[PDB]
Amino acid sequence: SKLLLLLIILSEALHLAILLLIKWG
Amino acid sequence: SKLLLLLIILSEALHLAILLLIKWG
Amino acid sequence: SKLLLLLIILSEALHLAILLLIKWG
Amino acid sequence: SKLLLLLIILSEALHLAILLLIKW
Amino acid sequence: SKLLLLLIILSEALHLAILLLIKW
Amino acid sequence: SKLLLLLIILSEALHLAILLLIKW
Amino acid sequence: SKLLLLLIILSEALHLAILLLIKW
Amino acid sequence: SKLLLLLIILSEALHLAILLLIKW
Ligand SMILES: [Zn+2]
């Protein structure tokens, strides 16, 4: 119920960790 | 100012990581 | 066991993604 | 159970520290 | 005013450091 | 290259934090 | 054991964040 | 500026404080 807010934040981060990684790669 | 946006997430993540670490256990 | 098993997976993904983002970025 | 109150404070201070570090 | 907020939090840590250091 | 010393430490912070979320 | 590791990890994060904030 | 001036102290203070807590 609240934990998924942790995973949302990790997903949302991984997406943009990679999204950046296309501007580099 | 790209990965600052990325970093902020990691902070916000760690915020909940710890906040959930004090309540549960 | 539900989102907990999903959380470990997610996190490890992110560790790799960051470790990568170090190497290339 | 008291240490964590330190740690959570540091994290809280870390995001504020970068939240305005972006601005520059 | 956005900065002030940082120091205040930053201070709260110190006390929790020393108050934890004095205790044990 | 300056702001990459955060991410390493932040990535290592979070990982441990989450690793320890498991342990508890 | 690890609850120390974070603090150490987390200090040298906040340290650098703040250091960089001052320098820039 | 002076708030900035002040800020340098606190943080580095906190670093040493922590450094101690780590130490002992
Ligand atoms: Zn997305």
Contact in structure between F21 and B21 (CB atoms under 8 Å): yes
B19 to chain D, any CB pair closer than 8 A? The answer is yes
What's the CA gap between C4 and E16, in Å, rounded? 31
Token representation of residue C7:
């959380």
Which residues does chain F have within 8 Å of residue G16's beta carbon, measured at their own beta carbons? 5-6, 9
Write out the residue range of the structural domain in which residue C4 sits.
Answer: 1-25
HEC profile for B1-25? CHHHHHHHHHHHHHHHHHHHHHHCC
Q: How many domains does chain C have?
A: 1
Solved with:
X-ray
What is the chain A residue with the closest CA to C19? A17
User: Alpha-carbon Rg of chain D, whole angstroms?
Assistant: 11
HEC profile for chain E? CHHHHHHHHHHHHHHHHHHHHHHC
Report CA-CA distances (Å) from D2 to D8, E16, E23, F4, H7.
Answer: 10, 9, 11, 31, 26
Letter string b/e over residues G1-23, b meaning 16 or more CB atoms within 10 A of that residue's CB: eebeebbbbbbbbbbbbbbbbee
